[PDB]
Write a protein that binds this ligand. Sequence first.
Ligand SMILES: O[C@@H]1[C@@H](O)[C@H](O[C@@H]2CO[C@@H](O)[C@H](O)[C@H]2O)OC[C@H]1O
Ligand SMILES: O[C@@H]1[C@@H](O)[C@H](O[C@@H]2CO[C@@H](O)[C@H](O)[C@H]2O)OC[C@H]1O
Ligand SMILES: [Zn+2]
Ligand SMILES: [Zn+2]
Ligand SMILES: [Zn+2]
Ligand SMILES: [Zn+2]
Ligand SMILES: [Zn+2]
Length: 312
Amino acid sequence: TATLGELAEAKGRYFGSATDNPELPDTQYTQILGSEFSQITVGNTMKWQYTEPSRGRFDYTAAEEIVDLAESNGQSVRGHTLVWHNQLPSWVDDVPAGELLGVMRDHITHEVDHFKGRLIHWDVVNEAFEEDGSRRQSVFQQKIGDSYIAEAFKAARAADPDVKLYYNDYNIEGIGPKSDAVYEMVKSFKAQGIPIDGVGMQAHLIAGQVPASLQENIRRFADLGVDVALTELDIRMTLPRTAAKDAQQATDYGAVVEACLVVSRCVGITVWDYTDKYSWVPSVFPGQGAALPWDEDFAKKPAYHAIAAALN
Ligand SMILES: O[C@@H]1[C@@H](O)[C@H](O[C@@H]2CO[C@@H](O)[C@H](O)[C@H]2O)OC[C@H]1O
Ligand SMILES: O[C@@H]1[C@@H](O)[C@H](O[C@@H]2CO[C@@H](O)[C@H](O)[C@H]2O)OC[C@H]1O
Ligand SMILES: [Zn+2]
Ligand SMILES: [Zn+2]
Ligand SMILES: [Zn+2]
Ligand SMILES: [Zn+2]
Ligand SMILES: [Zn+2]
């Protein structure tokens, strides 16, 4: 009957999926991508290695394709991601330390300016913290210092005043040292007048291990005055799939969706792609997989039933 996007929209939220250029040829895949979801995230081609492969020379070719596709289906789009220590072109490491801040600002200005007025959110900075809450020692942190995050948000706001600016990270779904650090940063930013409109909880979860404090965590961020979004939701399991594992995964998906629906400022959910066929999990987590609502043959799993039921 109604799609996840339609059910989500009926509750003032969006339900979308990330995608990547190489997948678009898959006709069965795109038909579902374009009809089931109300939002799309550019999976890879908005990343630094693609948009600015050589210093000062920008390339939005691949990203534009996905943005146009989303627009064609009437789907909103999330930009991902401007500042990240991963998938960074090699020339960035060679930039003299004293020049890096200026380079990061430039990268941000161009990309945000080019897509201005077409995206709903921008993941401005991604994974800037370690598990214990200390700063990840990336090229930006090391050469620019602690203010690089704040500078990144300022630059972004200066290039597009209407788009929502998000801080994105993983393992910040439950209350803990990592989410506390993000919590403090957001508090710090609000007090200093540093622009930031939301926190993106990637939500790359493990079946049977969903943080029970998820909802309370979403709520405290919302009380700080920022929106919250589950940006790259997937719940992996150790293969092979079994009925019991699928059922546990379904229960998990339902609890995650319910948590968002209970908090007024949880604007939406995005799954890191929607079919196991293209999930990034197997490639990064050896022995793990089957983390999405649709399996490799596009059959909806019990997980799908739970998501729809939670959305109502
Ligand atoms: O490169 C990053 C991955 O390393 C990250 O995977 C997290 C590692 O710790 C595990 O406990 C989490 O479940 C897993 O998601 O995901 C984000 C990616 O950018
Ligand atoms: O194809 C893979 C992408 O799907 C993957 O996306 C990363 C997953 O972890 C998140 O924290 C990152 O923000 C997101 O970009 O990156 C690797 C690429 O090979
Ligand atoms: Zn090109
Ligand atoms: Zn275009
Ligand atoms: Zn704490
Ligand atoms: Zn199947
Ligand atoms: Zn069903």
